[PDB]
From a paper:
As DrBphP and Agp1 strikingly differed in their enzymatic activity and interactions, we next asked whether these differences could be explained by the structure of the interface between the DHp and RR. To model this interface with confidence, we solved the crystal structure of the [name] from [name] (DrRR) at 2.1 Å resolution. The protein, which consists only of a receiver (REC) domain, crystallized in the tetragonal P41212 space group with four monomers in the asymmetric unit. It contains the structural features and the conserved residues critical for its receiver function in two-component signaling. The Ca2+ ions played a central role in this crystal form, as their replacement with Mg2+ did not allow crystal formation. Although Ca2+ is chemically similar to Mg2+, its larger size leads to diffuse coordination of the ion in the active sites and 45% higher B-factors compared to Mg2+ ions modeled at the same sites. In each case, the Ca2+ ions are hexagonally coordinated to surrounding atoms, which involve water molecules, the side chains of Glu15, Asp16, Asn17, the phospho-accepting Asp66, and the main-chain oxygen of Asn68. Given its presence in the DrRR crystal structure, we tested the effects of Ca2+ in the DrBphP activity and DrRR binding. We discovered that although the DrBphP/DrRR interaction was slightly stronger in the presence of Ca2+, the DrBphP enzymatic activity was lost.
A canonical two-component system consists of a homodimeric sensor histidine kinase (HK) and its cognate [name] (RR). By pursuing an integrated biochemical and structural strategy, we show that despite close homology, Agp1 acts as a histidine kinase whereas DrBphP functions as a light-activated phosphatase. Our results now settle this long-standing debate and show that DrBphP is a biochemically active protein that dephosphorylates the DrRR, rather than phosphorylating it.
Residue numbers in the entry:
A (entry chain A), B (entry chain B): 7 to 146
């Protein structure tokens, strides 16, 4: 059974980097992609009625149509989505951005680091924590 | 500034185990203790008017007076506390407990292991993630 990670990201290069970094993780992962918060809510809408939710959502803040703050609001307002772990992964390290993400009930916040090496290491640590150390809701 | 961890815990043996595990953790931590959900909310009330919020709150589900689910509800209902990272640390591995913790906007859920080796490791990974890998709200 792969663990399903829903990545919400508008920039193709960030998706490519995530898919390459997940290959190095040594936790069996399947990447789902939404290009903005509107695609993410449509994908989650289908998961309700249909088959499996993602185990984890990673979202960027600055995305067209439905941005990350708007997606966090919508996740926490929907009683069928409120339990989904939602982690911000974004290039902003602005304290005001991190406080607001946490106030909108993001589970965690990760700054995209400044080297490829540190990005690969971040994805290894994200996956070791959320998919190894921590318990997360079952997709069942 | 040490990183301040607020443990909501009445059991002296669990406080001893946490103190012992944090000694071995590579990360400079200061442990604050509240004996139940009601002491925790009073300490946080004083943080508003007075000095610093904790960087992270660790709570169990089964606690006298104000249980963990009720403490999470009270943290998220108070706009001055909603942003505080709150992690359930409990011996329950019931999937319905983990789903409910996440639905009430706990940031994470950690199952207390049954061996000293795995407990020390759990606390090392908790602290490396929340106080190293992740960004959390600043306290000052
Ligand atoms: Ca973006
Ligand atoms: Ca918008
Ligand atoms: Ca939260
Ligand atoms: Ca959440
Ligand atoms: Ca306890």
């Amino acid at each position: 059974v792969p663990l399903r990670l829903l990545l919400v990201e508008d920039n193709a290069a960030d998706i490519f980097l995530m898919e390459m970094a997940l290959e190095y993780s040594s936790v069996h992962t399947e990447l789902l992609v939404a290009r903005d918060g509107l695609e993410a809510l449509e994908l989650l809408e289908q998961a309700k009625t249909g088959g499996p939710f993602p185990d984890l959502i990673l979202l960027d803040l600055n995305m067209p149509r439905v941005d990350g703050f708007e997606l966090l609001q919508a996740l926490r307002a929907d009683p069928h989505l409120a339990h989904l772990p939602a982690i911000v992964l974004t290039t902003s390290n602005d304290p005001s951005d991190v406080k607001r993400a946490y106030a909108l009930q993001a589970n965690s916040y990760l700054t995209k680091p400044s080297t490829l090496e540190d990005f690969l290491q971040l994805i290894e640590r994200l996956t070791a924590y959320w998919f190894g150390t921590a318990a997360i809701p079952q997709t069942y």
